[PDB]
């Protein structure tokens, strides 16, 4: 259902590969991983590599983006000529760094997590995470000053002048006025178009400048729902000066109202939202009308079966989401999961 010449997909895939020549780097990686003769097909083999993740990755790489010369261009492309014998990890890492994905053993298959704008999967407040002896449910860390690079030299290969290594310099002159001037060199694996090399360097610079902080917030038994690369929200009531999460103490469906711990303050303008948990794990979100004292919250609609001591969160119009993508999940031989995440 994929036409490599036009780089278009018909509908749902269902599998059932087809032998057609294509420049899609996801399927070049797939061939590198699952070829029995020269690749890693004897070891490993199919059904160990997530083909759907590579399908979505190839769809992402086939998207049209500005060329920089006036036209359009596919986002990420092959045209590598591998002659020397390098270790399989080296080639896999070059493939996974050319298109911004990280390969991780999911548990049944080897999946790839691609850096893409994604929606939040779950929300964690200080009443949903493990509390150590020190009052630090969430620990935050930051990237160093010299690890925020603002100048990159990308080595691509020009097919127009001659098939030689052309160096493209990407800069962010605003960040050079803040964090000195941290310069690096990088090799764009499949690049033969100036736009792709510039895009790769710009992605590196933008990720180093925008994404800054990381969090460790080891959680309870729910952690078995998480795979690396999952985007989540952290409602840290200490990072903000207010309280925006807790547990529900009692639900009164008739004359719809809720009892919560802590105290909730309405904003001056706009309608605050409260996210509760349905009677079947579906986390619907409803609208608050008024709050009496600071506990009795009357909502627009009480969801069915909202049980007591269930997690509730508060969404205000003037509060940022603070999304974090997971990068590591560790079982603690305790029932708790140690999760590390980075800004999104």
């Amino acid at each position: 259902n994929y036409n490599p010449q036009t780089r278009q997909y018909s509908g749902i895939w269902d599998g059932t590969f087809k032998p057609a020549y294509s420049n899609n780097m996801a399927w070049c990686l797939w061939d590198m991983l699952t070829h029995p003769r020269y690749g890693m097909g004897k070891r490993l083999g199919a059904a160990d590599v997530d083909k759907w993740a590579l399908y979505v990755i190839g769809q992402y790489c086939d998207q049209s983006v500005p060329d920089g010369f006036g036209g359009t261009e596919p986002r990420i492309t092959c045209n590598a000529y591998l002659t020397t014998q390098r270790k399989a990890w080296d080639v896999l890492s070059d493939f996974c760094s050319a298109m911004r994905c990280m390969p991780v053993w999911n548990g049944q298959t080897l999946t790839f997590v691609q850096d893409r704008p994604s929606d939040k999967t779950w929300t964690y407040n200080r009443s949903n995470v493990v509390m150590p002896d020190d009052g630090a449910p969430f620990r935050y860390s930051f990237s160093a000053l010299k690890d925020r690079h603002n100048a990159v030299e990308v080595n691509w290969i020009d097919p127009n002048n001659g098939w030689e290594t052309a160096t493209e310099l990407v800069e962010d002159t605003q960040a050079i006025a803040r964090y000195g001037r941290n310069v690096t060199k990088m090799d764009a694996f499949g690049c033969t178009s100036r736009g792709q090399a510039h895009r790769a360097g710009l992605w590196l610079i933008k990720t180093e400048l925008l994404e800054t902080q990381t969090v460790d917030f080891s959680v309870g038994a729910e952690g078995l729902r998480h795979v690396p690369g999952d985007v989540i929200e952290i409602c840290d009531d200490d990072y903000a000066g207010i309280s925006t999460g807790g547990r529900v103490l009692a639900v009164n469906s008739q004359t719809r109202t809720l009892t919560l711990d802590r105290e909730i303050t309405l904003p001056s303008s706009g309608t605050a939202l409260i996210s509760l948990v349905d009677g079947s794990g579906n986390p619907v979100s409803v609208e608050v009308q008024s709050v009496t004292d600071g506990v009795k919250v009357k909502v627009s609609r009480v969801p069915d079966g909202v049980a007591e001591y269930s997690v509730w969160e508060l969404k205000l119009p003037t509060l940022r989401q603070r999304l974090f993508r997971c990068v590591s999940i560790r079982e603690n031989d305790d029932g708790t999961y140690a999760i590390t995440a980075v800004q999104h």
Binding site: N125, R126, S127, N128, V129, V130, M131, P137, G220, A221, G246, R247, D261, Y309, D334, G335, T336
Partner: peptide
């Protein structure tokens, strides 16, 4: 028993 201590006074026991 398997005991997890959450934040503001809550826990989880098995």
């Amino acid at each position: 028993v398997r005991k997890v201590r959450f934040g503001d006074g809550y826990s989880q026991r098995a």
